[PDB]
Amino acid sequence: KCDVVVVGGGISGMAAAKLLHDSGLNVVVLEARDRVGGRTYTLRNQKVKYVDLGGSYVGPTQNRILRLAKELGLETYKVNEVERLIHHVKGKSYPFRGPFPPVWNPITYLDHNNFWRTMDDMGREIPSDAPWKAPLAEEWDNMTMKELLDKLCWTESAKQLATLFVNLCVTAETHEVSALWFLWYVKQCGGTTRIISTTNGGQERKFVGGSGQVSERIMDLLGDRVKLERPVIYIDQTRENVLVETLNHEMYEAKYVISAIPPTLGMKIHFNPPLPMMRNQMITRVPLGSVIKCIVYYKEPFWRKKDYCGTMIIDGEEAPVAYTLDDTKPEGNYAAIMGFILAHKARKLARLTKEERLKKLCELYAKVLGSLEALEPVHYEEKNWCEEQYSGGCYTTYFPPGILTQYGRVLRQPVDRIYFAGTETATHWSGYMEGAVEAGERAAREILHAMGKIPEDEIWQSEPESVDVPAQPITTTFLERHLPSVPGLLRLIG
Amino acid sequence: KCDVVVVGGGISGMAAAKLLHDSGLNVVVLEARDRVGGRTYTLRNQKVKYVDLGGSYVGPTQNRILRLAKELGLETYKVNEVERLIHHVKGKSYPFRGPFPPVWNPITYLDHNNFWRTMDDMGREIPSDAPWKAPLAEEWDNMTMKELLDKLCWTESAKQLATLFVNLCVTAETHEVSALWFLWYVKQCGGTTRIISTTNGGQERKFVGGSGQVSERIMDLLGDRVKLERPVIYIDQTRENVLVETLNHEMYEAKYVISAIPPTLGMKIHFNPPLPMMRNQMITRVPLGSVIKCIVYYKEPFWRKKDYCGTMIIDGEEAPVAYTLDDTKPEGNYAAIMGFILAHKARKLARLTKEERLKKLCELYAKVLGSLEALEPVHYEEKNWCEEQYSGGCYTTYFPPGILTQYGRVLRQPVDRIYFAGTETATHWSGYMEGAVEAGERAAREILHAMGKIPEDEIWQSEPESVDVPAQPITTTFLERHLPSVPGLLRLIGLTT
Ligand SMILES: *Cc1cc2c(cc1C)nc1c(=O)[nH]c(=O)nc-1n2C[C@H](O)[C@H](O)[C@H](O)COP(=O)(O)OP(=O)(O)OC[C@H]1O[C@@H](n2cnc3c(N)ncnc32)[C@H](O)[C@@H]1O
Ligand SMILES: *Cc1cc2c(cc1C)nc1c(=O)[nH]c(=O)nc-1n2C[C@H](O)[C@H](O)[C@H](O)COP(=O)(O)OP(=O)(O)OC[C@H]1O[C@@H](n2cnc3c(N)ncnc32)[C@H](O)[C@@H]1O
Ligand SMILES: CCCCCCCCCCCC[N+](C)(C)[O-]
Ligand SMILES: CCCCCCCCCCCC[N+](C)(C)[O-]
């Protein structure tokens, strides 16, 4: 008994399922896996209490997920940043404060500052709405992030940090991704400072008890309406009602469909009539990134006694993990260090066993933190999202050179009675649980409008700022704004 | 009755289905569409007699498809190249002979000759077998064709021809594709001259009566064994026998499976257990190209009376088609001009209607050939492969930067009892009907060897050269081999100063 069938049981699909349900429509969520959540997964066991193996951090400006979470009963806590962060470079650890690791060489400094600034400068020229309408869309999209970096960075030290920055943001290589798309990505989160910041940015907080809780609690509000172990394999739009068919043979009929699965994963559904050419091809050109999330558990948060907060930014090819955060529960309990094994390394180290990875991570953390204690883990958890069939990767989808301009506007164009959600279709914090909410609700409202229940006026809604997580605005030093680039200085002579 | 289930009813799947069948095994071909052939499709109707709307040309060195075709009863005929070809550049038409349009400016000449030569030089370093083992695999793979071209080409005239060359070979933009992969592609066909040549190259000949005939005639040899309208949707390897399930609900059980569908199209099958991480992700990173094949029929082969053979190479953004060949049947009958609408243009002009495209093609062919007669088409056929669900595109699969080195060796690595065919897994003329044969048969022989019926020794077989289409070898002028590059000349005169 269905007005709308939502494909996809993740935050986006649930967010949508709920909005429709709240508005008095009969919905149904068909979910392939034996669990809701998708790219969020909260493991619960005795050694760990709870742990986010998937999507986890939420921050200021991410108002939608914060709102939906509150209403569903959930609370946040601050990720630990009281003590010092560590930038570990060329085999040595240098402690620091603030978002960016400091650089002492005045030339290198000019270069670094210019890089971050130019990402943001370039970004101001790309609309979130429609990145392909950027004045230099063609040029920028026809060129990789590695190219742009090779051009923009006069120092090896800045090329390397920039690379790490790209690797960490989108779990792909700089040579894999289009410049236009990457620049769009960063800007639709609020620029470099917002995206890279723990305190006052994207990694500020986590949900008490896990984020799996979000889509779980929505499943509760919907009773028997969410159907687990139901992978959709066929959508048929020939008749008056849309027929949607699952791998186990059940048939569902609906006036409308929200597809809230990752773009490329539409490949997994057979369509009748065939999809329009643009979409048929678009969905083969949009891969997801590669990451292993790893958590190592320790008797005590030892790092803090050495005045380290747990954050490590680790340069170099040999290091299996480039970025860590402290994962100790808000109490002091269950101390842990979180880390990502990114991009090409997620492929290299997947060859090893669970134990061999644990060993490599510990030896690293031991070197970086300079403490024997890191060699004594009390427990370990990991997830390699590269092997998930109904995910395709993590965190999100990336666009190779040339594809955003050409196939861009396809992603959220309705196909008859199919409407498209999922975070990759958001316009603010796309890539994140936030985007998942934006997209989920907009797609729902699109259907509402088609049924003539709300005006076009009302499809895209703005969101009131959170009271519990107010957003400090981002500011820049006069010197930051005005210092020359390395070439610019060379030009200030001859 | 199933020892091996073949998914994929195209030339590769059939080539395979037959090899196994001839060796006394019970096979089954499960095919999604209501026809075999796949990326070959031969339209038959009264206005046209027959027309290849899909894969069509065969040439010297393409011995496998040539052999399989002969044994199946088929014959070839030469594509028309008797008269002059046309290079149409900056609004004007310049007739010429030989494979390459001539260039007169001595500087530009050096640049052009060096470009073609360097494609081939770089290629000699890449193993067909395993392109990712090239000495400079990382560097080359991390970089797009547009990048390599921007670096290699000192003249705009050469950048443009090189771009067209890329567009035409792989139906993609230079900025879309990895340099390593592209250089591999060209070299596994026999280098630039072989790939671009009509006479004595890849476009020498067509099959009399169509190429759909190839897989069709194999369907005949197999009786009721090919099951049309059967799209596979689930493969299950948990048990002793592999279960394969179709969209209409039928179950098939087999000791082994050949998947002979385009790599990325495996996405369309749900697996149990899940695929290994590498494949699972590989198959999202491997798109197919974009092309519309367009044939315009005329009362007579009028071009020939003007001493033009029908070949047009057309530079420039405004032209909807960059390359045409003469499609007149070997008799003189049903005169026609064949042309491709490539890459980004395939997306742009799909917006228009059948008639609007015809008009644009006619106006172009009229300008290029300089004859009002082109404005008077007697009939028109077209296929836009971009809209094919069970194809994904045409002609073949292309690799974006970074993917070949990382995900390369995954393409033809067995997954338990699944073995992988399809042309994208060939090593000689991959991308082509030839490749489809190579890969089909190798896959089949892989299974044969797993059952201990033939030695490992015998999985990859070499192929005797055709008697009807012998291969003239490729040669180069002394001057071609030794003329400086543009930079090389700049160097050569900076050693007087
Ligand atoms: C995995 C990853 C993601 C991630 C992260 C770290 C990693 C390791 N860290 C994050 C961070 O800390 N902050 C944040 O905001 N997000 C972070 N994420 C990204 C985040 O997980 C995603 O942005 C978000 O969860 C996306 O949600 P969405 O709903 O848009 O996509 P999904 O979660 O994958 O849900 C899709 C559901 O659809 C089901 N599915 C797939 N195919 C089918 C078929 N064919 N039939 C029926 N159902 C299907 C999937 O199973 C899934 O449940
Ligand atoms: C389309 C294109 C191709 C082409 C060409 C021009 C264009 C417009 N010109 C060529 C040229 O002149 N010379 C040449 O040698 N080849 C040319 N081609 C390329 C050529 O067609 C291909 O290289 C070759 O045909 C590839 O064959 P292969 O067998 O390897 O791949 P396929 O033909 O697509 O066959 C696949 C079959 O599998 C079926 N399928 C797909 N999905 C499923 C599922 N899920 N279940 C069951 N069956 C499935 C497809 O329908 C297809 O029949
Ligand atoms: C200049 C420091 C180098 C970059 C530091 C910022 C780390 C980026 C964190 C992005 C993590 C994204 N995600 C999904 C894990 O939240
Ligand atoms: C230097 C002339 C410009 C390139 C001319 C060669 C045309 C390449 C033909 C490739 C066609 C491939 N295919 C599949 C249609 O056979």
GROMACS .gro file of C-alpha atoms and ligand atoms in nm, chain A residues 270, chain B residues 6-15 29-41 52-59 62 65 171 185 202-203 205-207 211 215 227 229-234 244-247 259-263 265-269 288 290-294 325 338-340 383-386 388-397 421-425 429-437 439-440, ligand 2:
model
  157
  270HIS     CA    1   1.699  -0.292  -1.492
  500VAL     CA    2   2.765  -1.808  -2.103
  501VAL     CA    3   2.631  -1.465  -2.009
  502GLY     CA    4   2.642  -1.246  -2.315
  503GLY     CA    5   2.515  -1.326  -2.660
  504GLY     CA    6   2.752  -1.107  -2.864
  505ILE     CA    7   3.042  -1.217  -3.082
  506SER     CA    8   3.260  -1.298  -2.779
  507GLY     CA    9   2.997  -1.503  -2.593
  508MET     CA   10   2.907  -1.691  -2.913
  509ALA     CA   11   3.270  -1.745  -3.018
  523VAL     CA   12   2.392  -1.872  -2.385
  524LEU     CA   13   2.173  -1.634  -2.189
  525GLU     CA   14   2.107  -1.315  -2.380
  526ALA     CA   15   1.923  -1.009  -2.248
  527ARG     CA   16   1.814  -0.867  -2.583
  528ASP     CA   17   1.573  -1.020  -2.838
  529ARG     CA   18   1.868  -1.070  -3.081
  530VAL     CA   19   2.226  -1.193  -3.070
  531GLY     CA   20   2.506  -0.963  -3.195
  532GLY     CA   21   2.528  -0.700  -2.920
  533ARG     CA   22   2.742  -0.418  -3.044
  534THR     CA   23   2.705  -0.559  -3.392
  535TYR     CA   24   2.356  -0.519  -3.537
  546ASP     CA   25   2.565  -0.247  -4.022
  547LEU     CA   26   2.448  -0.006  -3.758
  548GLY     CA   27   2.707  -0.144  -3.512
  549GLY     CA   28   3.048  -0.308  -3.551
  550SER     CA   29   3.144  -0.338  -3.916
  551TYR     CA   30   3.498  -0.312  -4.058
  552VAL     CA   31   3.763  -0.589  -4.052
  553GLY     CA   32   4.119  -0.577  -4.177
  556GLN     CA   33   4.247  -0.940  -3.765
  559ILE     CA   34   3.731  -1.286  -3.675
  665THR     CA   35   3.479   0.788  -2.891
  679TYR     CA   36   4.501   0.072  -2.720
  696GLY     CA   37   4.162  -0.170  -3.986
  697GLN     CA   38   3.898  -0.031  -4.216
  699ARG     CA   39   3.684  -0.452  -4.557
  700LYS     CA   40   3.327  -0.532  -4.453
  701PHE     CA   41   3.135  -0.859  -4.453
  705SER     CA   42   2.839  -0.875  -3.945
  709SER     CA   43   2.668  -1.439  -3.420
  721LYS     CA   44   1.799  -1.817  -2.483
  723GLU     CA   45   1.515  -1.217  -2.374
  724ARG     CA   46   1.703  -1.359  -2.072
  725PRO     CA   47   1.891  -1.078  -1.883
  726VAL     CA   48   2.095  -1.231  -1.601
  727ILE     CA   49   2.029  -1.062  -1.265
  728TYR     CA   50   2.186  -1.281  -0.999
  738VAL     CA   51   2.250  -1.811  -1.255
  739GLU     CA   52   1.908  -1.637  -1.247
  740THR     CA   53   1.734  -1.426  -1.514
  741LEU     CA   54   1.497  -1.131  -1.493
  753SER     CA   55   3.074  -1.346  -1.843
  754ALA     CA   56   3.102  -1.195  -2.187
  755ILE     CA   57   2.934  -0.863  -2.128
  756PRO     CA   58   3.106  -0.524  -2.115
  757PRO     CA   59   3.300  -0.496  -1.787
  759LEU     CA   60   2.773  -0.402  -1.716
  760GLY     CA   61   2.845  -0.661  -1.449
  761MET     CA   62   2.703  -0.396  -1.220
  762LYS     CA   63   2.369  -0.516  -1.350
  763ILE     CA   64   2.411  -0.855  -1.177
  782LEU     CA   65   3.209   0.311  -2.254
  784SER     CA   66   2.973   0.782  -2.700
  785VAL     CA   67   2.888   0.761  -3.071
  786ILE     CA   68   2.599   0.786  -3.317
  787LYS     CA   69   2.644   0.586  -3.639
  788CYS     CA   70   2.474   0.760  -3.933
  819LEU     CA   71   3.354   0.635  -4.533
  832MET     CA   72   2.872   0.641  -4.343
  833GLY     CA   73   2.968   0.882  -4.066
  834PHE     CA   74   3.020   0.892  -3.689
  877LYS     CA   75   2.193   0.428  -3.422
  878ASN     CA   76   2.279   0.613  -3.104
  879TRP     CA   77   2.455   0.348  -2.895
  880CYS     CA   78   2.455   0.581  -2.591
  882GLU     CA   79   2.161   0.102  -2.518
  883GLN     CA   80   2.108  -0.041  -2.166
  884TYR     CA   81   2.275  -0.368  -2.240
  885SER     CA   82   2.561  -0.197  -2.407
  886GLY     CA   83   2.646   0.124  -2.224
  887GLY     CA   84   2.801   0.283  -2.533
  888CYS     CA   85   3.032   0.208  -2.826
  889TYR     CA   86   3.271   0.115  -2.956
  890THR     CA   87   3.444  -0.002  -2.638
  891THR     CA   88   3.538   0.076  -2.276
  915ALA     CA   89   3.552  -1.281  -2.190
  916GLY     CA   90   3.441  -0.985  -2.398
  917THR     CA   91   3.659  -0.777  -2.626
  918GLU     CA   92   3.779  -0.542  -2.353
  919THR     CA   93   3.975  -0.843  -2.224
  923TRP     CA   94   4.261  -0.563  -3.144
  924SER     CA   95   4.080  -0.526  -2.817
  925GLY     CA   96   3.790  -0.293  -2.879
  926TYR     CA   97   3.710  -0.470  -3.201
  927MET     CA   98   3.517  -0.778  -3.324
  928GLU     CA   99   3.861  -0.941  -3.351
  929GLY     CA  100   3.922  -0.889  -2.983
  930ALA     CA  101   3.583  -1.029  -2.908
  931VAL     CA  102   3.691  -1.353  -3.072
  933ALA     CA  103   3.872  -1.323  -2.560
  934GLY     CA  104   3.573  -1.549  -2.616
  993LIG     C1  105   2.871   0.011  -3.155
  993LIG     C2  106   3.003   0.032  -3.221
  993LIG     C3  107   3.087  -0.080  -3.218
  993LIG     C4  108   3.176  -0.102  -3.322
  993LIG     C5  109   3.183  -0.012  -3.427
  993LIG     C6  110   3.101   0.099  -3.430
  993LIG     C7  111   3.012   0.122  -3.327
  993LIG     C8  112   2.904   0.221  -3.354
  993LIG     N1  113   3.270  -0.034  -3.530
  993LIG     C9  114   3.351  -0.144  -3.528
  993LIG    C10  115   3.436  -0.167  -3.633
  993LIG     O1  116   3.398  -0.127  -3.743
  993LIG     N2  117   3.516  -0.279  -3.630
  993LIG    C11  118   3.510  -0.369  -3.525
  993LIG     O2  119   3.580  -0.472  -3.518
  993LIG     N3  120   3.424  -0.343  -3.423
  993LIG    C12  121   3.344  -0.233  -3.424
  993LIG     N4  122   3.259  -0.212  -3.319
  993LIG    C13  123   3.304  -0.264  -3.186
  993LIG    C14  124   3.258  -0.409  -3.180
  993LIG     O3  125   3.121  -0.403  -3.196
  993LIG    C15  126   3.290  -0.471  -3.045
  993LIG     O4  127   3.428  -0.468  -3.029
  993LIG    C16  128   3.240  -0.614  -3.031
  993LIG     O5  129   3.115  -0.631  -3.095
  993LIG    C17  130   3.226  -0.653  -2.884
  993LIG     O6  131   3.155  -0.774  -2.870
  993LIG     P1  132   3.136  -0.840  -2.726
  993LIG     O7  133   3.063  -0.969  -2.734
  993LIG     O8  134   3.276  -0.852  -2.669
  993LIG     O9  135   3.043  -0.737  -2.646
  993LIG     P2  136   2.891  -0.718  -2.690
  993LIG    O10  137   2.891  -0.720  -2.842
  993LIG    O11  138   2.826  -0.599  -2.631
  993LIG    O12  139   2.818  -0.850  -2.634
  993LIG    C18  140   2.756  -0.851  -2.508
  993LIG    C19  141   2.620  -0.917  -2.509
  993LIG    O13  142   2.582  -0.939  -2.375
  993LIG    C20  143   2.448  -0.894  -2.354
  993LIG     N5  144   2.420  -0.856  -2.214
  993LIG    C21  145   2.451  -0.739  -2.151
  993LIG     N6  146   2.411  -0.743  -2.024
  993LIG    C22  147   2.353  -0.862  -2.004
  993LIG    C23  148   2.294  -0.918  -1.891
  993LIG     N7  149   2.295  -0.845  -1.779
  993LIG     N8  150   2.241  -1.046  -1.896
  993LIG    C24  151   2.247  -1.117  -2.014
  993LIG     N9  152   2.306  -1.062  -2.126
  993LIG    C25  153   2.358  -0.935  -2.122
  993LIG    C26  154   2.432  -0.779  -2.452
  993LIG    O14  155   2.299  -0.763  -2.493
  993LIG    C27  156   2.516  -0.825  -2.568
  993LIG    O15  157   2.435  -0.900  -2.656
   0.00000   0.00000   0.00000
